[PDB]
Amino acid sequence: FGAVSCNVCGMLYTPEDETQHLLFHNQFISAVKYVGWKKERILAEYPDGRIIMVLPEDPKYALKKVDEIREMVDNDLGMCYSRTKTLLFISNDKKVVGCLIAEHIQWGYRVIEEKLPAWCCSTLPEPAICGISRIWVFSMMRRKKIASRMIECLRSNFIYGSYLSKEEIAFSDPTPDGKLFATQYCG
């Protein structure tokens, strides 16, 4: 062996990999700490937690909380923020186990892109599509159908009174995990 997987941070490190575990560790535990603000925007309750949503109009403490989770997600993986919404899964331990950021696109044209291993589809844009920019769940909580619950809550609530359909959702170019999570839906 010689390499480790941290039991509270999830990273696998070791040189210079441990001097990078410290910085991500500190960024992690400080990011996932959810105190529990008043009048949170719960979309669904669960035995293993619940799903809140934050909007760009919310208090500063909620927004700054989201940018620090976001900034944590990006380093764990390596645009216009006024139109986003962010969903967070919190554990019963008052910790954030899942994050999903989706942009409301007003000017998106359906296109088909040829890709052997660009055609227009309409003269007008689609009325509303939900672009998923970030989908993240903490490694020691993965494979527990909790991103699936963030999509299910995404689609029930990203636009009040309507239930997003496969046509009405896009996403940014995925990772292997994002791909492995997507073929869930394709079919």
Ligand SMILES: CC(=O)SCCNC(=O)CCNC(=O)[C@H](O)C(C)(C)COP(=O)(O)OP(=O)(O)OC[C@H]1O[C@@H](n2cnc3c(N)ncnc32)[C@H](O)[C@@H]1OP(=O)(O)O
């Ligand atoms: C930003 C972009 O748009 S791409 C960014 C993608 N995010 C990441 O890569 C971060 C690291 N990965 C993760 O956080 C998670 O693996 C996510 C976000 C991809 C999905 O979270 P998960 O909780 O694991 O997904 P969830 O449990 O809800 O459903 C996963 C399903 O995907 C399918 N799947 C198959 N293989 C895998 C795999 N290796 N990993 C994940 N899902 C898989 C399964 O059908 C699985 O359902 P099942 O467990 O009942 O068999």
Ligand SMILES: [Zn+2]
């Ligand atoms: Zn650690």
